[model samples]
Target: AISGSLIERINNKGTVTVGTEGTYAPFTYHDKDGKLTGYDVEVTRAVAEKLGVKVEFKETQWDSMMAGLKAGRFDVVANQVGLTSPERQATFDKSEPYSWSGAVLVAHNDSNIKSIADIKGVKTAQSLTSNYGEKAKAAGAQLVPVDGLAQSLTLIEQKRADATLNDELAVLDYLKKNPNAGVKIVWSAPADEKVGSGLIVNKGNDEAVAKFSTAINELKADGTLKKLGEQFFGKDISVQ
Candidate 1:
């Protein structure tokens, strides 16, 4: 079986390559010393350990990371890739989610917007490929598509957009580290309204996918997932 073969290969090779975007802080990002550090990095490292293999991380742009996986540049994506319904239609298989967070609507602290409802008729910036744009439009905000998180923040800074929505953890991480960024969270949907992030492998890598899923579930059952969540997010965020 492919799963058995993959396990054999890992036992023989001693290492596995994982891909991630080092720009998305708290999920995958470079620390001040230029070493990768984040929730995804930690989770992948733990998975590699459980497989009895060393781990190598490949830093790629969020837009191109999946291509790296498809092209065999890495065995899996550890980029906090959100598992949206539309993404499931593609040829990617996700492991069971280890942690969950929701989308938050953020604006300048002085902005009149107090919640999602207040953004009606307002142009809002969101990652062009993010689920937040879909949800925001569904809530009646005029959608302004931006290529990445930095651009979305810039749109809000320039007042070109009334607000922007992003993953709660990422946004809170930014706010904590850059206190003067001037962004304030005005609204956030319940976690159920948000897609969860998980490790992804190409559709045919069923062995690798199943192995990872089982490892993640085991970690969750034993409280490792909750401990890691608190280590990074200041609270246990794994879904019960």
Candidate 2:
């Protein structure tokens, strides 16, 4: 049902080798039953369907994921790889953005923090190295450094921090784990400021990138992306 030819190699092999960091939850992680599934996995599956091929996932660390891609060890990365961030070091085709995300403020249930403005000058746990950290600071919230989502929530619960600024998906995942975490999303950064992510393909993989580009736009236009976003992320991050 697809028009563009992204890769004849896939037509021959009958499967597309997709690279991904399966460690990232929600986006690309295994289930408790050890089944491979998540947003990126689902998205890749859709891409494969559009291309009329099967998919094979290759798990690897984010640190050297694209290195493997560039080396031809795998075809594309489903690692929530940012489309335009300093994190992307090498050249590659960042197919159309698949998921869009932003830093959102989460505060205790009883806290008066209803927005970034409500947390101004108040301490909020964050990983200072992330752009979200800078966003928190820019929002006038004091940054209380934390390693990851769990720490951020722990500090908020202990009252050691007033709030936390992190990825909306991670925040939702936290709430999924702690149904009564005594916290609520106070506010979200503007959608325009949110980062867009997509598949990362090796440079000069013209057919693959072209087909993927077409596949993504078609997926979005037809609402497949929105459906998968709600299924995995609890919110539609595909269109933002």
- Compare the candidates by lDDT and give the number of the best one: 2
TM-score of each: 0.81, 0.68
lDDT, candidate 1, 1-240, per-residue tens: 322444555647556778887777788878899988888898888877777777888887655666677777787788767657466448788888877777788998698898888878889887554567766787788888776566788788777888887888888888887788767888878856656678887787677777888888887888887788888888877684
Tell me the alpha-carbon RMSD of every candidate.
3.5, 5.6
| TM-score of candidate 2 to 2 decimals | 0.68
What is the C-alpha lDDT profile of model 2 across 7-119, one tens digit per residue? Answer: 77555546678887676678877899998888988999998888788788998755466668777777788876674544453577788889888778888888888887777
lDDT of each: 0.77, 0.78
